[model samples]
Target: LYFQGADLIHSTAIIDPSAVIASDVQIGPYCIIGPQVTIGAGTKLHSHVVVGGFTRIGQNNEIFQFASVGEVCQDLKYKGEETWLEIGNNNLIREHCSLHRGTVQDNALTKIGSHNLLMVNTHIAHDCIVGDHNIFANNVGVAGHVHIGDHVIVGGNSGIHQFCKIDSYSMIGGASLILKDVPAYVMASGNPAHAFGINIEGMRRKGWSKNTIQGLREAYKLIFKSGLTSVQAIDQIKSEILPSVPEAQLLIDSLEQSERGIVR
Candidate 1:
């Protein structure tokens, strides 16, 4: 049974007529879809999926069973304001995941980008902005107002603190507690996570050049191994080392722009 013009919908599913569902979208059994939801073409919802609030999901995404998207936030300040959840194309939200909508105090929108793989039991809290091509392993929990950059890999069961930033090409080890920002192209792990080294293997997998990796290596040494302060290290990297390398620039910019400071 289909409601309106959806490609396929299970008989047990209940979708609001005001929901804008494009062609080739499939809603599975026992799914509850609210009026403000908009599902794009080639998107599929597995069984027991509940999508509500002002959610707009893009094309070719697969949401597995018992996943909740666009639900109300857990923040105590939420007073039923018109917040939103916007998800980009080709994302895989696996089983038992709960992705909440944003809060009005922050960006008023929880935005997730394309080609990301979120494994089972992951929780994306309110106002989180997640970038593209990221892999979030099973049971990973991100607190509210977190910003995760592109090509990042978060290990299983890790807990990221609120207002933290995880930059691009970074890897966090399993069961780590991330309290501060993780810089670009770095590998971090442990309770109250600390930077171990640059993500050389990850960068190489992404086809980064040897010179770029070497420049990042030097930048990491300047920031971590050398006795320089944060400002001194950033200045040194910008002035003396790899000014032309965009990877090094990313590291420098992350160091400079960190609000809660970066993991040492």
Candidate 2:
């Protein structure tokens, strides 16, 4: 069935008339869509998907079977109020993923950027501010109010504590319990998730120079190893390393911006 002439719509799917669907979108079998939801061009929702609340999804994204996007949050404080969930272009959301809307106590919005791959059974809780090109492996649970920066990879079954900040290019190992912030370009793992080292593999993948890689190492050492206070180390990196390695600034910024103390 075609809702619009340009769309591939399933007859069994229930989409509200008020929902704004782009011409090139596809709606698969048994999906239930609610009002005030907007899906942009070239997006596809496979079987058994549900989208509710004030959710807006961008172009060329694929939300697979049994995925729930923009549903009301499970937060205890929520009381049937309207909230927003925003997803960016080219993201692939796999089976059994749940992306929730936010509560009024916070931003009242959960936002995700482009090209993110969320694997099976992954849950992104309410009010999470997520960035681009991230890979969240199967069964990873991101708690509410967490902030994730770009190009981050989190392994399977990790429980990211609520309100934690995971910065750009950090790699977290599988089955870890992250209770605090994970800074940029860092590798953290194990129960309670201690910082192991800088993400040298990630820097190498970007084809950064050995000098740049070593500069990241020094910055990591300054923050994790040197007994200096975070404020003192951040000042030193800004003055000494930032002039030479621009990418080091993300590392410095991650340390400076962490409200929950960074994993050591």
Candidate 3:
């Protein structure tokens, strides 16, 4: 609640005058906005929000209290190089979330796609790439160099290791430690994270019929249950499963090009 005759400011907040805050923005009490931070139109920052260090936030984002975003990379390889934290439109960043800047080793950018809902106490480490339409629950921490795909939902307290790749539409259970890649349309859980099954419930929520779910189930079996090697599984899935259901091909492509092997 910072309103002084239509001009909003707090006695304790520190905002660099040169920083670009759009005219429509409402910055609450005691917030610290560093230099060169660009907040887009219609965005609202609640109390004690610390935004700094070359961060560019898109339109209509709601950042809650005590959130620290766009800080320097934690990696020692980052020698105060020119790095950036870029957020897309319409995101909801809840309380106490920490999003760090990228490192020199990984393009020096921490990029988040549009329409993402990051819950309280979540940490998005340096060099992480997040896709659109995702939900990361509270205390879900993702390490640097991880690539999370679109429409993904990660449960609370999940810890994703560095260099992991989580495929599109995958649902990762809470408190699990992800050490490898997670395939699309699957449910992954447990310590060290194993794919339990296809995410039938999630798929149904997205309006995918039973037939598509069954097809993806079969594809999952072909890829994980057949006991074939990774390449062999891809070969069979390509020759047999993919031609019938092309929608699941994106997961296959992600797997085929994955540097880190898929979870389960």
Candidate 4:
């Protein structure tokens, strides 16, 4: 016994009888929602969207045409194991995007945080955990078991290596081959990703003060310019720099806890 509004769902949608759609949810023409898919209230699906598995999409999400969410993982090691995809609120999943569920190898769940913009033709691989307010440009491909932090921007045609962690507020350049983890608040670019500098434009957009930006620039020079090892840089940064500018410490924290080594 669920509430539904008149004209909320289009008649041309091929919705499974067992699919539970909440009130005020707009389902467009030719959309196919598989069994056990629950689309929450205020969600709008454009034409040609296919949602499958035990996927739970949150409210106020606008999934565009030709996007397929909650599909089975493409992992070769996936032996038909039960997995799930959980998407949070206000996500704008654009055209031709593909998000796969986790394989049996990892936690068996692919989780997406709120307010993300998954642009056209992007593919988020199995067991990936994407954080809030992130942007994945067209044709951006992320491998399995990758963890992305908040406010990160992945440029067009970029590829993130498997099991790598991209920290918060980092901006990557287009066509960059990210073979390793990228620390927070930095700009990484090129064929193999290299830490270029801090994300100045992103920081300004996020309303960070000019003084904070200056501190980050100074911190970047200290770490990459001193010819110090990662460990030495972190130690020196913690003891010398963090007391002055705490925002710059995010990069140090990411490097210390980085599972995959940081991008050069």
Candidate 5:
């Protein structure tokens, strides 16, 4: 505790000397950031936040009060040593969001991407490779063995259990229960969960062209609204949308091969 860290970094913050803090980082009162943790430039830790166990947080991250980053696993299979967390830049970890490391089942790393928000009191179980630009909702109960890709908003109180793989740009609703997989550009909600629609404005923001979203929206019409039978709508997607727009093939691929019956 010399000059700048003595004043800019709060005196009550308990940061290990070997914790590898980049310059301009600020730690608030009573934050316990442990060893083997690398916090990057301009990362801010609020009061009572606890980080431990071989974790590397990238720059521009703001973790709020009582959030526990890189804790040990609650996965029933985990019994090993030193699993790690690699969090990327420009993210927010809110109050009490407990992000855990992977079990010994797969690789020993849990990865979280950039530009995301872990809403207050959210829970992530072991081995969740969460992707970028996501807002994982508050009070969402997510169990182990999950993969969430880019640009998603898992709405509040959504319960995803036991290996649900959600693809990019998908929406899972508030109070929704997901026991299955969610595919790209779609919305799934309800107690048992049914496919609701496509990500119109979400695609609109992500450099998606006009026809790409048009193709997906059109596929939603043929599948759910037209009252076509299962195979009827499946073939309709391949027949109608191809020879020009291939983005709708994601719809065909997910609808065809999903083990959980495409959330319908």
Candidate 6:
């Protein structure tokens, strides 16, 4: 039975008639889709996938076998209140990953942006906001209310603490425990996750100029190695760095707005 112009649906799949599935979508065997779900065009779900709650998945996403999307949140404060999970286009959700809905305490919505790769066994906990073009390796777990910025790379077996903000272009090494915020263009590693250096190689690959990266290195030194307070660092950055390299403003803004502080 084709619903809403879907290309094919396996006989073993259980999908509610009220679910909104767009054209060119395929649902494989043993997949379960609930009534409040909406899947956009060109999406495909492998066998044994379960999508529930008030969820909306965008176009061209490929969800592998046994992945759970839009399930109820694990928060104790959750009481079946109609929270939502929103996923954007062109994402790859690998096997056994769990993407849950949000709770009432935070934004009441878990939002993921476009073109992301969520590897096998990855868990996106409640109320997490993930930006576009991020890559999450296998077994990576993010706690509730974490904010992940664009182009971030989270290594395998890393666990991000709750409410921590990972800024754009940051890279976390494998097996790290991220306890605080990770500023943009930085590389962090170790058990508690200390800031090792700027992600210069990553920036190079993204076509950043040499001056841009050099300024970030100096900013990193001021923040971590110079023993200056954050205020002093920001002041120095404004007067000395931002004039020559305006891109350093991202670092200054990150330091100023950090609620949990940054990995130092």
For each candidate, what TM-score against the reference?
Answer: 0.95, 0.97, 0.93, 0.93, 0.85, 0.95
Question: Candidate 4's residue-wise lDDT over 162-248, tens digit each?
Answer: 999999999889999998888888889989889888888767887888888887887777777888888888887778778888987
Residue 30 lDDT, candidate 1, scale 0-100: 96
Best candidate according to TM-score: 2
- For lDDT, the strongest prediction is 2
lDDT of 2 at 102: 91
Give the lDDT of residue 260 in candidate 4. Answer: 81
lDDT of 5 by residue, 128-221 (tens): 8889998888998778867788888899988887678787778999999998888778899999888888878778887788987888898888
Off by over 4 Å in 2: 1-7
Model 5's C-alpha root-mean-square deviation from the true structure amounts to 3.4
The lDDT of model 1 is 0.92
Q: Which tens-of-lDDT digit does each residue in 47-160 have in candidate 3?
A: 999996689999999999999999987787779887899998899999999999988787889999889999999899999999999999999999998998899999999999
Candidate 2: tens digits of C-alpha lDDT, residues 203-242: 7887999989988899888888999899999988988888
Worst 10 residues of 5 by lDDT: 1-10
lDDT value for candidate 5? Answer: 0.83
Name model 4 segments beyond 4 Å from true: 1-6
Better of 3 and 4 by lDDT: 4
lDDT tens string, model 6, 1-264?
Answer: 766531287889999888998868899999999869999999999999999858999999999999999999888889998999999999999999999999988889999999999999999999999999999999999999999988999999999999999998899999999999998888999899999999888788878889988998998888889989999999998988899888888788778778999998
Instruction: Give me the displacement of residue 162 in model 4, in angstroms.
Output: 0.9
- Report the Cα lDDT for residue 138, model 6: 99
Output candidate 4 Cα RMSD: 2.1
Could you give candidate 1's per-residue lDDT for residues 209-245 as a string of tens digits?
A: 8988888999999999999999999988988676667
For candidate 2, the lDDT comes to: 0.93
